[model samples]
Target chain A: ANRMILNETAWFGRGAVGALTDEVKRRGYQKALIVTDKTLVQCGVVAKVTDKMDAAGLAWAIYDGVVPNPTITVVKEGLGVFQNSGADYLIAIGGGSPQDTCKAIGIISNNPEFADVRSLEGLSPTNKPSVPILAIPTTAGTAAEVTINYVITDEEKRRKFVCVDPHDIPQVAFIDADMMDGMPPALKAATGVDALTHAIEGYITRGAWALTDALHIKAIEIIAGALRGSVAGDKDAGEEMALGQYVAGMGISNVGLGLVHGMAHPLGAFYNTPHGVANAILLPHVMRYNADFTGEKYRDIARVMGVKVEGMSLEEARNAAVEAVFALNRDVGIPPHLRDVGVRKEDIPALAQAALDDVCTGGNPREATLEDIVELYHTAWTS
Target chain B: ANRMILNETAWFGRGAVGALTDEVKRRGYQKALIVTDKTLVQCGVVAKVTDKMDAAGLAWAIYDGVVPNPTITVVKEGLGVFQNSGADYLIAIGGGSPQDTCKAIGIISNNPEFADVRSLEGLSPTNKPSVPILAIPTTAGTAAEVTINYVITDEEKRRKFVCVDPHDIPQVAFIDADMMDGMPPALKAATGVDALTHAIEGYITRGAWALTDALHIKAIEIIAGALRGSVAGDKDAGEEMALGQYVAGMGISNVGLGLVHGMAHPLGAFYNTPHGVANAILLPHVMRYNADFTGEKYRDIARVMGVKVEGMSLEEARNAAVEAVFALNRDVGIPPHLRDVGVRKEDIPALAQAALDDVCTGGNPREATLEDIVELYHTAWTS
Candidate 1:
């Protein structure tokens, strides 16, 4: 038995960011310490959110040096900035990187059990939950704000491990679609596919039940409906993806993910491949492998993916579902194999072992042995 | 523009009360104050919850003296108990009386400006939100846990005044069907009808949109499918009504309710009629009056209510929808007239004015003047 949730109150749309000022004042927080990367801070996404805080007569300090992987050092540094600024709450703005960084800082601030960082890995039983954190995502891909899980590179161990705990969930999320419209085409494509992978993985995970099924099915329908237009830089489509990805997160965070996330974490750790790109490249191969164990759920996915499965046989519908994912991947410009992301054949064994230890690996629909993982990696490798 | 949500989350099913211990610990509350009514306490339903809370190492105090129409004095007394108990959180554990009383205590505790009680009417801008409350309904009706509104009888004024502020929304709700098993047949029939009124009223409210449409449609389907058996004490149907009522609340809280609620509130205030029976008797009559303004939406409701509208004309479909409501009301043993509840013909105009003054009046799809309100009351009186 587990408890799962993000903020009970979230606003969606263009100016929903305005909700921040009221939230800060109503809660009577003195100030907020903004966490983000230089890219988003410069892009004015961070300013839009901060301006709301300013208009509400709230004081705030910014820490804009958070790097892509949001290393443990960034978490510690953010904590220092929070303490010095005497801010009562944290407002993390940007993609997965900053959002993940803020979660770690909040967790460490209240729970000394994981202050050393490494102890936070793989569902540590921390004594206290994270401090109240508000998340506003500038990217549609990583649902870090909505998820209870966050990834940070364990630089000492040479791996990227997931820390999943319900307490780390943010107290509020403002996913205004207008904010997500700034992503470039490639970022949109990668993140859009990452969301698709989450929807597919969460739907088939063993922990899924009726409640999760409702959320996941809705996510699959929306993402499949709007992902292509979103990657084409359609603002409305981006808005749809912004909500779609968050909806996907709502499902996967409670249940779990499959091989794509398991393998993508290592790619992110070893070679620093962008998370979404790795997920996009790996999703199809893993889906084909897991299809045998998924039973008729694949047919439902096919129907949701817009396949005309009403008159088709079960196997044919499954094939259509697989093909629908491939077509979407091609349209979004996700490469067909791992070599495009610089994965070499020789790295497969080590990557497979690391992937086996990845928290997401346990939720895969099909039980994969070490050899099965290695073969899946080899299958993805162009060499 | 502002949005107010009454429910943060609601867990459904038999042992869903099992979720309370973890919820208490997750929120870091050391002690809980349980607010329930004497009937439920006498029936031992309070023990069903407290026994679990004790085993989970949580401390609690109980207040079970709430009367049928909870008064400001009831709330004030509960507040004293809450403060002396040193409980950080409240678990509201019964139907309307206890649940409504819990809201008043929570609302007054945080926003002392509204401590005068009467000042809290009609969207009062409380300085702060209430102390966190977790509502667990032991009745399938009322849905007090999931509405931004609470009604308290002003005994001296002889009025039922609605408090419509976002501040009083519960932090969470545990809508476990197991908690509601103590309800007798009459309570089930009345509550199930009240839930139907919420769905019908919400579907036609001026504030409704696509998001609310989804919840209302599904709620109507579940209610039509399950409400009859539920009134007969069928456990399976009872579970469905619990979810169905909660789902109806999710929609109506965001949108506005309509004439059924408007008329029902006055009956509850003037004659001390049970809320649901009043709404149930008036639902179909109000539906007929609003049918022209409802457009083709009734066709959807007709299909959902299991009417064979496949080849019917739109007008026929609308009429059939009204007939279905009438049939369901009769099946549930609800009277077709206000006379059954002891309403006199001479009282029509005053009740009509009271209904017209209800805060819910502005949300009805069709506008009703004083004459229209009087006529509806007269019709309800004569039936």
Candidate 2:
């Protein structure tokens, strides 16, 4: 039962979106609805993509309202612009936020029955496929361009829900590091570890199998080698990180992630925490908690992360894997505790319950009870 | 412009095809036209697929007229059978022959403008994608199920023509080792090396990039470590070989292959030589031939194949990679010369010309002159 669904086509390396013109004409799509954030439009990153489109005489319209943890309201707003634009397909540009909004718009455009957005959560039974989407990621994190699922928030309920549908995966993706160069150093550091967490969590996820194991391991090696330098402004390292994260998505999208994602989601819901910061803080503690249940996989993680695991005890190897992540997060200036990020102590119980309710928690290697979850969060908040 | 086109979905592992029934129903493919060889049908491997179809009450019909080096005539025959069956999709079983035939039949079925078949050679300007195809590879030799191109012979012209179409990749592929369990030892030994050659040639191919490099390296490591044991009868090794070869296709389909493929195609045309045997005999020689032009890639190959490249000189590393392939071939009992097969020395000139004319030669890292190709065949024959 090891099934994989992947983006049908992708372009990598610098200037990847420059190759988009021929494909647009070849596929006979006349116009595109460009979905991204106001930040990119103001920074002129959106223009970098659209200029190439315009040169090919392609028509496009922009919806630049996406924010972190895009909500149903944002998706609905984007869908209105798409419906009025005479666009035959969608152009998703930015990090996960814009892409996630675009997927919801595309999915509901074709499968109107799920227009409420909440109905699309947790493996939608929507009959129709998405309107064709060409995803171009501006950041090397999230890898939303290739993933079959997207996280969207329900503001009223104060929770994030994952929408899983193979039909929602983009028809094409452009993972160009050229698009990532404009990212600020702090954002780069934050998102780079998001990619790192994807590799580490997916490696130990219950759904992982042989094909995914190879992909995750390679992703870990690539991200571990490139992230620090990418954050320090190496263009080549940024390019390497781009592929590393995208490769991580290629595996984790097919399987599922672990408790880092499970716990991280609630922080976004309760405190509007940047998703990467939440993950970066929780990842080390989650690794240590799950160490006993994840057989030999932590050893593999430690080895890839550059820890010498040659003759280390199993306990030492697992501890070293957690230590390595803590060091990477520290070096990247990722806040080490919930208190560092404004996750209030009073919200711990709700966050713990929300974590257990999150779809990703089921795939965690270790089982967690409500008491354990609350205690773990309390410990991480102080540790 | 680095571009990649991949199979949209795939399932791997033991009993991989056991998961086929659910997808057949999920995708709403009403009736399947099964494309395979008479050998598979007689050996009851065909029923392993059909029994699942029957369990789901899904309809299907068989076209078991496939032959190795499947020609235009065979594709035409399958097309006729598919047209009469009221089948909405295709199930391509067995190895490259049936899968290649199935791709042509499906492509021409949708875009009937290429009904002549010859016009689809070397990147046809077809507008439509093929009828959805579900691929089950019985032998882990040619990864035609995942590759974007298929090789079909023009028997009247005595040469094979490759159809380079992203449309031809199967919609879904099941790489089940369960089906491969029935493979004869000789066929496993022969076909396993074909997978090895794909990894080696693609690793050094001119179109190779960072993403493809990772894929090809991982493929080589798995195939190098597993092939001998797979041939000696290990189901686990056979499963690993299946994944290794498919991953090779995942890379090579995006990039290209080299002179081993360039030179080997002509052998199939001129002598009806088995494709794997031709590549196996020529592989080591081709590695030596292209060594000077491929910088550091051979060192990478040597490292992955278990040669300690740390202290070795560059020349020594490249030589070790070639020697490793040579030793592996000898251990797997591949006949080491053209004479061991039935090729005549007189055919070298025509074969060399055809090799030069092959589409794959342009992607050879080392450019070969007609005289050089002739010399290579002669050297391999004598040595």
Candidate 3:
């Protein structure tokens, strides 16, 4: 039996955030702790959402303590703010940082026994759902608002750990491009590639079934057509990326993803690397690494990436799939090598070990071994 | 805001029903009132499900009163049985008959203030979600297990009222082809086209969005490939139909549908026509009626259904889309005309008025008028 899960309700398109206040009113949530980052607040994107809330007379408080690669500290801080504010639900209003922070806060609040943070790692049976979250994403990246997975860096351990808890999936998601339009060029490029990595890896992940395959492939096609234009600040393309990434979330958050995510997590942990940048840098190399085990599924990937695969043999199609991803990474301005993201030559072995120990590694189509991951990391670094 | 809904947890593939006991134990429900029909129970298909629960020491009671076009009377009786048997949750088996009946029972049982059933029509905002339901489908059709729509007949009034309530979606769904393999040929044919109609109508509906378009288009492609084979009793094709129909549910249940459903509902109400058979008979005619309003959508539907839309004019493509559905209806052994399904010419005016008033009519790509629906029914009767 294949188990699938996603947000209860999602609103998309340019002005989808307009429904935020409406949903809050309908669900009768008394107050919201708006989980977001200082940059979004400083830049006034948070107000675009809160202004609507105020107009509707919806009460809310701000917790703008989130930062990229959200940490346990940030989660705890947000939890304190939420409790102090007496909010009934969370409105996660940024990228992975606030969204990830929000999940940790919601999870621990509902299941205080797992308040230690680290104990909630890898499918914790929390015995309860997280506090209701109405997620309004500010970047067309991470899709944390819709995905069941969240990453919180354990600053003490010098590593980021992934927590896969279905209980943490937001109750509602607003996939509004207007909210995502504030993304910087670099943010778009990095997050866009992260979205692509999700589509490709989720397509071939061991647990993927026909339904999730449908979501992932359509996501790949959309990302292929929209990512570069989105990075260049095209509004329509930005909307496509927003939906594409969430579509990928509707799959990867359920079925799982392969070596790209598996290996990327260690890079984020080891170097405080931006998650998307690491995934973008490693996607092509990992695709090449896992090609033999993926069968002709790569042909579908290659074709959706706009490759002419009709006359191509399986090997040619597989290589084309890798090249298509590499071209996107190049055009989107993602750094081409792991070393560019600050991976030291001496750290490759430890990174490989950490990645192999990551929960996501088990879902890679190829049952990657220690030596294989090490070599893949080395290849990604200098190839 | 577009509100989308589906089962929170869906288990797919062969033997997915084997997880029933596991899920029941996980959710910690005490007992289930199994909603199905006597035909299923007599055929021992219901036994296949019940035996598993029995072996696992799970408790259950059976309500096999569901009939085709399940009436309000059936729903009331099922509710009484549920109350008397002390079942805490519902297990809906079989196709729409049981599933629709199950929703009416669960909803009214939770919100007894609407025990009249008729009061629950047209997007009722029931104060609470329905009693927890775990749906196991014995037919690869309706997708009622996953969809938020259900139909209940008012036998006294001779009308089928459609209810769209997100609160009524099953909490979990088991999409096992093994449960569907017992379907007789005509049942497969009729249900298969209902699945196809959902895909086509959902693609062109006024409320359709990018996310739903992806699901509907994928559903069109899958149903086109599998429906013929499924009606021929192929197990693999049956599995594809199982998923294809649910995929359509994933789309149409959220974004709304078109004139095919608007027209088909009245047929189920007036003549006691099977829902899918009425839909199969009217789909192509309605597709033609709304063709001009559908933009380039029909070209994609045509292409998916095996039409050579390349180099074809828009008019030709639209024609091809209608013909493709007609051809599938013929190949799948569905009756060719509304007249074959017991439609009386004298009743056309009344049926057309009822269709124009159907909740689904508002979402048709073309805003249909009385004469337009009358013409569609006339065309479907003999053309």
Ranked candidates, highest DockQ first: 2, 3, 1
Candidate 2 lDDT, A210-270, residue by residue in tens? 7788889989999989988998999899999999999988887788997889999999998
TM-score between candidate 2 and the true structure: 0.97
Q: Across residues B1-383, which tens digit of lDDT does each residue of candidate 1 receive? A: 22435354556678888888877886788888999888888888999889999899889998887887788788888989998999888999998778888998898887777777888888878887788899999877777888878888887877788887777888778888888877888888888888888988999898886546666877898889999889888988988898888878876667889888888887888888998889988888888889999878899899999999989998999899999998998898888888887887887788888889999888889998879988888777763
The all-Cα superposition gives candidate 1 an RMSD in Å to the true structure of 2.7
- What is the iRMS for every candidate structure? 3.5, 1.2, 1.5
User: Could you tell me every candidate's TM-score relative to the true structure?
Assistant: 0.93, 0.97, 0.96
> Share of real contacts kept by model 2?
0.77
Docking class of 3: medium
TM-score of the B chain in each candidate versus the native B chain:
0.97, 0.98, 0.98
Off by over 4 Å in 1: A1-4, A292-296, B1-10, B25-28, B291-296, B308-317, B378-383
TM-score of 3: 0.96
CA RMSD, predictions in order: 2.7, 1.6, 1.8
Looking at model 3, the pairs that clash are none
Highest DockQ among the candidates is held by which one? Answer: 2
TM-score of chain B of 3: 0.98
Instruction: Kindly list the per-residue Cα lDDT of model 3 for residues B1-383, writing each as its tens digit.
Output: 56676677888888898988978887789989999999999898899889998899998999999999989888888888988999999999999999999999999888899888889988887888899999988876888988888899988987788888878989889999998888999998988898888888889999888888999999999999998998898989999999898888887778888889999989989988988999998898888889889889999999999999999999999999988988888888888998877899899999999999988898898889999999888988875
Better of 1 and 3 by lDDT: 3
Q: For model 2, how does the per-residue alpha-carbon lDDT over B10-123 read when each residue is reduced to its tens digit?
A: 998889898899888778788999999999999999999999889889999999999998988998999999999989999999998899999999999999999899999998
Whose TM-score is greatest here?
2
Q: A1-383 in candidate 3: lDDT tens per residue?
A: 68787776778888888988877887889999999988999998999998999999999999998888988888889989988899999999899889999999999998999877989888888877899998888877787887889988898987778898878888788888888887899999998898888888899998888888889999999999999898887888988998898887888778888778888988888788998999999999999999999988999999998999999999999999999988988888888988877889998889888889888888899999999999998898976
Fnat for each predicted structure, in order: 0.05, 0.77, 0.66
